[PDB]
């Protein structure tokens, strides 16, 4: 039997997939902690209810719940004229921080995650290693929105199930939600609800657009806390990211002439 032709193009069978991924990677490069923070400061000017929490160092899977509880307990104190006990931000005066706490209705909690580290310190160490070599690697940004006004926790994973299956995260967040009912109780005894935002992979074809996706979802949520934008997405991976690219470009222009490393006034 005649031998099959083996072409003198080692990668040709992957050309289409490679071209799409290269296109996507070029459209939306990685967003790290500093630009995310600038974007949050900008978002606050548009939506005063959003407190621009610092992403340095970012929360992790090991301490995001403790960080949220500290912030809410401090907000409770501020509304009662009592001392705050939580760690203070670097780029904000303590007085301005108190005013942000008094005003905020929504905590944008960005979590930086990597499969390998098993502790908070290991995670920070991994974060440092990757940063100096300029690699994303297997790291991933996640967003937890604590909507105080609606008593809603929204979990956004652009890779859908990168940390754990969505039902396992649902379970963990549901237990956390009832802890928040005791920590930050409501007059009418309305319970904190939990929403897993992503029903499938949004970030198809990319290893770097996670940061931008989180900020885009947040902005969609800020425009409409009932948004179904994740369902109205284009099917094509490339089209999704060229829409995201316009968002990114608009944001980067919007913050270009905004003050560096400083919170806006509450």
Author numbering: 136 to 401
Extract from the study:
CE clan proteases, specific hydrolases for ubiquitin-like modifications (SUMO and NEDD8) in eukaryotes, reportedly serve as bacterial effector proteins with deSUMOylase, deubiquitinase, or, even, acetyltransferase activities. Here, we characterize bacterial CE protease activities, revealing K63-linkage-specific deubiquitinases in human pathogens, such as Salmonella, Escherichia, and Shigella, as well as ubiquitin/ubiquitin-like cross-reactive enzymes in Chlamydia, Rickettsia, and Xanthomonas. Five crystal structures, including ubiquitin/ubiquitin-like complexes, explain substrate specificities and redefine relationships across the CE clan. A comparison to the previously determined SENP2-SUMO2 and NEDP1∼NEDD8 complexes (Reverter and Lima, 2004, Reverter et al., 2005, Shen et al., 2005) revealed differences among bacterial CE DUBs in three variable regions (VRs) near the substrate binding (S1) site that were arranged around a structurally conserved helix (constant region, CR).
We determined high-resolution crystal structures of the CE clan effectors SseL, RickCE, and ChlaDUB1. Interestingly, the remaining bacterial effectors SseL, ElaD, and ShiCE are Ub-specific proteases, and ChlaDUB1 and RickCE cleave both Ub- and, to a lesser extent, NEDD8-modified peptides. Like NEDP1, ChlaDUB1 can remove the C-terminal five amino acids from pro-NEDD8 with peptidase activity, but does not cleave the regulatory NEDD8 modification from the cullin RING ligase adaptor Cul1. A corresponding VR-1 region is absent in ChlaDUB1; interestingly, the ChlaDUB1 C terminus occupies this space instead. NEDP1 and ChlaDUB1 contain an insertion of 7 and 24 residues, respectively, in what is a short β-turn in the other structures. In contrast, ChlaDUB1 forms a helix that may serve a similar purpose in recognition of the Ub C terminus. Matching their specificity profiles, ChlaDUB1 and RickCE can both form covalent adducts with Ub and NEDD8 suicide probes. Deletion of the inserted VR-3 helix of ChlaDUB1 or the predicted VR-1 outside the crystallized boundaries of RickCE resulted in a total loss in recognition of the Ub/Ubl probes. The Ub/NEDD8 cross-reactive enzymes ChlaDUB1 and RickCE fall into their own clade.
